[PDB]
Amino acid sequence: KQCEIQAEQISKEKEEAERELEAALPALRRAQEAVDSIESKDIVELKANKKPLDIIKYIMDAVLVFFKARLSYDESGIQTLGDMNFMKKLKEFEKDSINEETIELLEPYLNQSEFNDTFATKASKAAAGILKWAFAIYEYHQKSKIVKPKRIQVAIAEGRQAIALKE
Numbered sequence: 329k330q331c332e333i334q335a336e337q338i339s340k341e342k343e344e345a346e347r348e349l350e351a352a353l354p355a356l357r358r359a360q361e362a363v364d365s366i367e368s369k370d371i372v373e374l375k376a377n378k379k380p381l382d383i384i385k386y387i388m389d390a391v392l393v394f395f396k397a398r399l400s401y402d403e404s405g406i407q408t409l410g411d412m413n414f415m416k417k418l419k420e421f422e423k424d425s426i427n428e429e430t431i432e433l434l435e436p437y438l439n440q441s442e443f444n445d446t447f448a449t450k451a452s453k454a455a456a457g458i459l460k461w462a463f464a465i466y467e468y469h470q471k472s473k474i475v476k477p478k479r480i481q482v483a484i485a486e487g488r489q490a491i492a493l494k495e
């Protein structure tokens with residue numbers, strides 16, 4: 329009867345986890361696909377600009393903060409973008425690396441009048457993707473914390489059901 333109850337609980341927990349994943353992850357997947365589709369011409373042209381725009385600077389500050397390069401100097405961002413390995417690093421960073429203090433500091437910096445995909449696309453074609461990607465990171469932090477006990481419980485419940493059948 330523990331096998332029966334745990335089978336039902338595993339089914340319910342897996343359904344809930346799949347629903348949460350369908351709710352959250354596809355935004356990140358679409359943002360990452362859009363980022364991968366960005367041509368190098370736009371980034372190269374914007375890198376050589378004499379001065380940065382307000383919206384681009386504001387988003388780039390948070391983007392560099394996420395990359396552990398906590399520097400507000402535009403030259404630092406130019407140096408970071410100079411390396412070609414950044415093209416790989418766009419698809420390498422994960423969401424679990426986010427810290428609670430980082431989100432707490434970035435939440436005030438989220439300028440509601442300024443951030444918007446449609447309005448920001450006019451300023452630069454490449455700027456549109458990164459925004460949503462960051463949001464899918466900010467809209468997944470504090471939910472991975474909620475799902476982590478659920479994920480662990482699902483794995484342990486499946487294993488324990490198998491061991492219980494053997495016993």
